[PDB]
Amino acid sequence: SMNPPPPETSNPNKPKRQTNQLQYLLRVVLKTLWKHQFAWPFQQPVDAVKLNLPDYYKIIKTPMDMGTIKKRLENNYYWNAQECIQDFNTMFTNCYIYNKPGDDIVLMAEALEKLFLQKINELP
Ligand SMILES: COC[C@@H](C)n1c(C2CCOCC2)nc2cnc3cc(-c4c(C)noc4C)c(OC)cc3c21
């Protein structure tokens, strides 16, 4: 496999919690971004094989996508909201590191991030 293993969504050794903030991140934040017209390039790990990007996983050390975040939320992987927020932030920063500033994917990421930042502003 020329893709790395995806980021883990279950680990018996990692303690976990359900908090109001994590339920909000699932039911409101992820739910909103997931249903956005531009969600789909972010709904699964970057497939470097399918997309013919042999340098992607030479450059991006900490890959992250909303498919992974959705499973981490549903599977109770997280201890706190900040871990989940960091995963979103990483997904956006990775996009801005790898792609050119004028690229369509960066415009898609920017639209999702604006919605994200507004929902995080409203964290309970
Ligand atoms: C708009 O389509 C772009 C096209 C290349 N693409 C398709 C088509 C589907 C139909 O078959 C042809 C390929 N699927 C995907 C799925 N994920 C993608 C993720 C990124 C991406 C992110 C996010 N961060 O870095 C990168 C890099 C991406 O960036 C150019 C393109 C993706 C992508």
UniProtKB/Swiss-Prot annotation:
JQ1, a thieno-triazolo-1,4-diazepine derivative, and I-BET, a benzodiazepine derivative, have been tested on tumors with success. Treatment with GSK1210151A (I-BET151, a I-BET derivative) has strong effets on mixed lineage leukemia and promotes myeloid differentiation and leukemia stem-cell depletion. This is Bromodomain-containing protein 4. Ubiquitously expressed. Belongs to the BET family. Chromatin reader protein that recognizes and binds acetylated histones and plays a key role in transmission of epigenetic memory across cell divisions and transcription regulation. Remains associated with acetylated chromatin throughout the entire cell cycle and provides epigenetic memory for postmitotic G1 gene transcription by preserving acetylated chromatin status and maintaining high-order chromatin structure. During interphase, plays a key role in regulating the transcription of signal-inducible genes by associating with the P-TEFb complex and recruiting it to promoters. There is a cross-link at K58 (Glycyl lysine isopeptide (Lys-Gly) (interchain with G-Cter in SUMO2)). Changing N99A: Abolishes binding to acetylated histones. Phosphorylation by CK2 disrupt the intramolecular binding between the bromo domain 2 and the NPS region and promotes binding between the NPS and the BID regions, leading to activate the protein and promote binding to acetylated histones. In absence of phosphorylation, BRD4 does not localize to p53/TP53 target gene promoters, phosphorylation promoting recruitment to p53/TP53 target promoters. The record marks N99 as: Acetylated histone binding. The NET domain mediates interaction with a number of chromatin proteins involved in transcription regulation (NSD3, JMJD6, CHD4, GLTSCR1 and ATAD5). The C-terminal (CTD) region mediates interaction and recruitment of CDK9 and CCNT1 subunits of the P-TEFb complex. It is also required for maintenance of higher-order chromatin structure. It is linked to Cornelia de Lange syndrome 6: A form of Cornelia de Lange syndrome, a clinically heterogeneous developmental disorder associated with malformations affecting multiple systems. It is characterized by facial dysmorphisms, abnormal hands and feet, growth delay, cognitive retardation, hirsutism, gastroesophageal dysfunction and cardiac, ophthalmologic and genitourinary anomalies. CDLS6 inheritance is autosomal dominant. A chromosomal aberration involving BRD4 is found in a rare, aggressive, and lethal carcinoma arising in midline organs of young people. Translocation t(15;19)(q14;p13) with NUTM1 which produces a BRD4-NUTM1 fusion protein. Residues 17-123 form the Bromo domain. Interacts with p53/TP53; the interaction is direct. Interacts (via CTD region) with CDK9 and CCNT1, acting as an associated component of P-TEFb complex. Interacts with RELA (when acetylated at 'Lys-310'). Interacts (via NET domain) with NSD3, CHD4, BICRA and ATAD5. The interaction with BICRA bridges BRD4 to the GBAF complex. Interacts (via NET domain) with JMJD6 (via JmjC and N-terminal domains); the interaction is stronger in presence of ssRNA and recruits JMJD6 on distal enhancers. Interacts with NSD3. Interacts with NIPBL. (Microbial infection) Interacts with bovine papillomavirus type 1 regulatory protein E2. This interactions may serve for the tethering of viral genomes to host mitotic chromosomes allowing successful partitioning of the viral genome during cell division. It comes from the Eukaryota. It is found in: Nucleus; Chromosome.
